[PDB]
Amino acid sequence: NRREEILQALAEMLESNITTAKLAKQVGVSEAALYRHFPSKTRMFEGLIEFIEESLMSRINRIFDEEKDTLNRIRLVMQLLLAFAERNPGLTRILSGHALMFENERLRDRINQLFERIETSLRQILRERKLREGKSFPVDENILAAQLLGQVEGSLNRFVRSDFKYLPTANFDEYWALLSAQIK
Amino acid sequence: NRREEILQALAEMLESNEGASRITTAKLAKQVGVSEAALYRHFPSKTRMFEGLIEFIEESLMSRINRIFDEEKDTLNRIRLVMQLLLAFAERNPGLTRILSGHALMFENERLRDRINQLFERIETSLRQILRERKLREGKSFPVDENILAAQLLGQVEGSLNRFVRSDFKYLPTANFDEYWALLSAQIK
């Protein structure tokens, strides 16, 4: 549970209005112990992205187990992403690209992997609806999946851009009414 | 015109492989053929330079949207063209898109952040105006309120542009625009 405690404390600090040393003192350990898990600040943020991706996928998989309807499953995965963003504005800023760190390539590459994993999960759900339920979409599932992912990323971007005033979940019911019409 | 050369050179610096780091007045000075101190005589700060650039982008997009209103009268064809213009503009100006997609250097400065928000508000209002005329032109509206739909359309554009920047410009927004339109049409027809 060592590496997670550090990432948890990192997440907590990002949500407040960061330095390896400051985080070390925060979790209550030497800088050497911290550097053993994350040899550098970039590796630390890279680890935070992985920690976020793993937590989100664990929840997505739970939605897959409990929800059988492919339509509502897409809806829940979207609502989960928007709700998570909304509740973690500091994390959303680094994900949306409004953070300095986004300049670092391996960190950007890493964020891309997280969005691609989410997008893949959406495509998977669409493919199942297509093949198991016989649904015929007006376009390739990859295009529908990109639009769904685009709507989320655009909500997250506007949320940061507006200094966190325009909520990601605002009008989701209305957006979903239009998006779902061609998924149903 | 040493006001346009600076904004022009600035666009290039952001447009070059310098998307990596931050631009400096020094490097910008050399890229314009002058001194740092000489640059600060036209713009009190680098932030004012970015704001002049946002201004340019806004004038460019608003002008192109004005022409769409004049050249196309069908509501859906007008939406298609504005969505296409926004995505096409981003692909033609990768560096400029980085600003609009967000950047620490951009949103930390409250005047530049507000400015970028005005640009998006200008776009959103144009979309809202287009959607609103459908009721009087064809006697019908949309499955959701026009203000909500304008925000949804803008959101898809902002999501595509973010992905474009994030993937280091490997994902091209217009790549499958024709199929994206077939899907969007069916949803809002």
UniProtKB/Swiss-Prot annotation, chain B:
<dbReference type="InterPro" id="IPR001647">
    <property type="entry name" value="HTH_TetR"/>
</dbReference>
<keyword id="KW-0131">Cell cycle</keyword>
<dbReference type="Pfam" id="PF00440">
    <property type="entry name" value="TetR_N"/>
</dbReference>
<dbReference type="GO" id="GO:0000976">
    <property type="term" value="F:transcription cis-regulatory region binding"/>
</dbReference>
<comment type="function">
    <text>Required for nucleoid occlusion (NO) phenomenon, which prevents Z-ring formation and cell division over the nucleoid. Acts as a DNA-associated cell division inhibitor that binds simultaneously chromosomal DNA and FtsZ, and disrupts the assembly of FtsZ polymers. SlmA-DNA-binding sequences (SBS) are dispersed on non-Ter regions of the chromosome, preventing FtsZ polymerization at these regions.</text>
</comment>
<keyword id="KW-0963">Cytoplasm</keyword>
<keyword id="KW-0238">DNA-binding</keyword>
<dbReference type="InterPro" id="IPR054580">
    <property type="entry name" value="SlmA-like_C"/>
</dbReference>
<feature type="DNA-binding region" description="H-T-H motif">
    <location>
        <begin position="24"/>
        <end position="43"/>
    </location>
</feature>
<dbReference type="InterPro" id="IPR009057">
    <property type="entry name" value="Homeodomain-like_sf"/>
</dbReference>
<dbReference type="InterPro" id="IPR036271">
    <property type="entry name" value="Tet_transcr_reg_TetR-rel_C_sf"/>
</dbReference>
<dbReference type="GO" id="GO:0006355">
    <property type="term" value="P:regulation of DNA-templated transcription"/>
</dbReference>
<comment type="similarity">
    <text>Belongs to the nucleoid occlusion factor SlmA family.</text>
</comment>
<dbReference type="InterPro" id="IPR023769">
    <property type="entry name" value="NO_SlmA"/>
</dbReference>
<dbReference type="GO" id="GO:0003700">
    <property type="term" value="F:DNA-binding transcription factor activity"/>
</dbReference>
<protein>
    <recommendedName>
        <fullName>Nucleoid occlusion factor SlmA</fullName>
    </recommendedName>
</protein>
<keyword id="KW-0132">Cell division</keyword>
<dbReference type="GO" id="GO:0043590">
    <property type="term" value="C:bacterial nucleoid"/>
</dbReference>
<dbReference type="Pfam" id="PF22276">
    <property type="entry name" value="SlmA-like_C"/>
</dbReference>
<dbReference type="GO" id="GO:0010974">
    <property type="term" value="P:negative regulation of division septum assembly"/>
</dbReference>
<dbReference type="InterPro" id="IPR050109">
    <property type="entry name" value="HTH-type_TetR-like_transc_reg"/>
</dbReference>
<feature type="domain" description="HTH tetR-type">
    <location>
        <begin position="1"/>
        <end position="61"/>
    </location>
</feature>
<dbReference type="GO" id="GO:0051301">
    <property type="term" value="P:cell division"/>
</dbReference>
<dbReference type="GO" id="GO:0005737">
    <property type="term" value="C:cytoplasm"/>
</dbReference>
<keyword id="KW-0175">Coiled coil</keyword>
<feature type="coiled-coil region">
    <location>
        <begin position="103"/>
        <end position="132"/>
    </location>
</feature>
<comment type="subunit">
    <text>Homodimer. Interacts with FtsZ.</text>
</comment>
